[PDB]
Amino acid sequence: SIMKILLIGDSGVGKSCLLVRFVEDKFNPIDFKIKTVDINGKKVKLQIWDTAGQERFRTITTAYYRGAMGIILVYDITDERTFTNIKQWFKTVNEHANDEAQLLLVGNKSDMETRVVTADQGEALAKELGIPFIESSAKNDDNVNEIFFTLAKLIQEKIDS
Amino acid sequence: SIMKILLIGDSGVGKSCLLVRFVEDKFNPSFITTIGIDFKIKTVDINGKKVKLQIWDTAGQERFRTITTAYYRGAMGIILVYDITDERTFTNIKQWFKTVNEHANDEAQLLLVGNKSDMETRVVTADQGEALAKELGIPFIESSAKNDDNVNEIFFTLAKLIQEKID
Amino acid sequence: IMKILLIGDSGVGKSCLLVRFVEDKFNPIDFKIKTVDINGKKVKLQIWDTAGQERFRTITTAYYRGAMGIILVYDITDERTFTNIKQWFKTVNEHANDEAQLLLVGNKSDMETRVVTADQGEALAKELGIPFIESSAKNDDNVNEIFFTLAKLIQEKIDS
Amino acid sequence: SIMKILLIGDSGVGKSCLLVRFVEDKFNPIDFKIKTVDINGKKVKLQIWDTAGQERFRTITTAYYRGAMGIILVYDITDERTFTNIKQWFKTVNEHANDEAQLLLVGNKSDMETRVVTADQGEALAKELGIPFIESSAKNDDNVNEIFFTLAKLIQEKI
Ligand SMILES: Nc1nc2c(ncn2[C@@H]2O[C@H](COP(=O)(O)OP(=O)(O)O)[C@@H](O)[C@H]2O)c(=O)[nH]1
Ligand SMILES: Nc1nc2c(ncn2[C@@H]2O[C@H](COP(=O)(O)OP(=O)(O)O)[C@@H](O)[C@H]2O)c(=O)[nH]1
Ligand SMILES: Nc1nc2c(ncn2[C@@H]2O[C@H](COP(=O)(O)OP(=O)(O)O)[C@@H](O)[C@H]2O)c(=O)[nH]1
Ligand SMILES: Nc1nc2c(ncn2[C@@H]2O[C@H](COP(=O)(O)OP(=O)(O)O)[C@@H](O)[C@H]2O)c(=O)[nH]1
Ligand SMILES: [Co+2]
Ligand SMILES: [Co+2]
Ligand SMILES: [Co+2]
Ligand SMILES: [Co+2]
Ligand SMILES: [Co+2]
Ligand SMILES: [Co+2]
Ligand SMILES: [Co+2]
Ligand SMILES: [Co+2]
């Protein structure tokens, strides 16, 4: 009952760190990892993919999206540009992912005082895009597990409908 | 949650002192801010809910930054300050108002503050301040960072107006 | 990394301003590095300073390649170095990048033999459309401010 | 059985002396030593590796880490540079050592009045790296045994 989940977004927002915090629970300043969780009383294996710093030289590959049922769009709350770029990522993902894939918006680095994107702004963009929103901190381990459990539950719902 | 507030005005009117009095409850006649960290944080209760204020304050010879569009990005509150003992800083408020209106977002709430009300050498009356505020269409408050007079009121008044409009 | 250049007539104190900023010392290859903390980040400043006989080099187009900050310096005790600022401004604008942020510095403010007033410097800066700061590498007055002010303007620009 | 432990850090911080103080209980101003310890009513043989000065001329040989279950990162509290370099050592160890290896940060030469790195700073870095912290003095025999016993227990614990 594997669930393929992708982390997408501008380089530098903290994608690889969120994944490391979730699987290993660590932070420090074969492109996937596995972690098994329980969903509605059933063991679910999450196959979590990390871009491998390749979003800097070319668009996401086809086989990358193949089988992906969850796609997490991440931006940096301290970097306006990465937030503005979310619309482009959303477009790219929609023009290539399965029609039933569930998306989720994550505003990362909520621990930083240098924040320039407010929670209200993130919530507003998520609403406009029609997807759930979560603010996290891979550094302080804030809401990281929630990202994956929230997304996994939404995916389990689509599968059963 | 977070409210970005800027303190603007002629150098020497008491902007940094007002911020220090509000956040650290201190006042140094010879205080000197640190070149590097431009803002401080303080969480206050507005309508029974926690609001984090991100208060920005620039140094004198870093004044060029206060005329750029980038500096006002995201600010929802802008406090214009003058020295009641220095006519020139009061006269300059109109220029600051212009700069703020042209480089900042039209949704930001402004507030006029006449500081150093503790000084007997005052030359700008409260009526004059009130009159300018009215002309500009913004709230007015006289304060004294030195004697801790009406400093908290500056920020709570502004925060409530910003919230009152967020709705 | 942020490439910053110090330009101006020989003898105004360019090297002494750089030494004071990095080594905080004052003594009466062409660049030094110093990491500063702005907007909660470690920005590395690559500060360039050239000798007198290397002046011929400071007027070339390659010297300004990549520079995002350019500090124009004059001696407040030497009218000629102040008058020459307009020529330096012209050379910089014609040989440097349009996005580069300039800043005018009047150095040696500690000297009683000053002949250029702060008001004059402020007026020229206004005319040129750039920030102005008076400093003293000798007494460590406003030296850090020169670089932090410039670094912030360069950053605001990058993010703008 | 046997527990392989390595001491890593800038040259001159006192790695070799900490090992001598622990095994021979001596101080003076093969590349490994053996010492059998008792942990929770159980005897454990510690194979403690000394760098042999390698750090002064080369990257620690990939096989030097092989089999290591304990790695002690050491700095000199009187030398800021050796403390700053700990982050690089941590990176090198994490990229070449075994995943299960337990790390520990040691601030040595605590006997010196010329200290420039505070205990708080050391504790803060240890926390940031996610590893235990101990300040020692091979010279005054302060907390040297604690280094090895603490690490041995964490390794056993991880077993
Ligand atoms: N303050 C802060 N920094 C973070 C967080 N997550 C990642 N970072 C930092 O952001 C940079 C990029 O993170 P990384 O995970 O490699 O980004 P990726 O390109 O999206 O994979 C690194 O310098 C991280 O230490 C966070 O939650 N808070
Ligand atoms: N008497 C008096 N002096 C004040 C008050 N506030 C600031 N000052 C003094 O005015 C000078 C400049 O204040 P400062 O906060 O640095 O001004 P800024 O340039 O606007 O940041 C300092 O000498 C302060 O002690 C006040 O409420 N009363
Ligand atoms: N009084 C005084 N002398 C200074 C200052 N800065 C540099 N000088 C002196 O001016 C001369 C030239 O300085 P230097 O940095 O080599 O000038 P450059 O040609 O612009 O590099 C030396 O004698 C310095 O000691 C200053 O801030 N005050
Ligand atoms: N004061 C003092 N000196 C120490 C201590 N430990 C080692 N030293 C001295 O530091 C120098 C280097 O020690 P050594 O063990 O060879 O360092 P290594 O390069 O890390 O192996 C020698 O001069 C030692 O005597 C200590 O705890 N206190
Ligand atoms: Co990455
Ligand atoms: Co101030
Ligand atoms: Co008070
Ligand atoms: Co020179
Ligand atoms: Co200094
Ligand atoms: Co030419
Ligand atoms: Co040694
Ligand atoms: Co002993």
Side-chain angles (χ1 to χ4, degrees), chain D residues 87-105:
Chain D
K87 281 195 171 185
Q88 244 306 305
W89 282 118
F90 183 75
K91 181 178 182 177
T92 304
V93 170
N94 272 287
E95 284 185 288
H96 306 89
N98 188 294
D99 319 305
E100 269 56 72
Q102 170 67 54
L103 273 57
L104 164 70
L105 181 64

Side-chain angles (χ1 to χ4, degrees), chain C residues 87-122:
Chain C
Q87 243 305 304
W88 282 117
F89 182 76
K90 182 178 182 179
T91 301
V92 171
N93 273 291
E94 285 185 289
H95 288 94
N97 328 305
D98 149 286
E99 289 285 65
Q101 176 64 56
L102 271 61
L103 162 68
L104 179 66
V105 174
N107 192 47
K108 305 194 187 179
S109 62
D110 56 281
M111 300 288 279
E112 320 283 44
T113 51
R114 166 199 289 275
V115 293
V116 178
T117 67
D119 281 353
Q120 286 182 287
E122 285 165 41

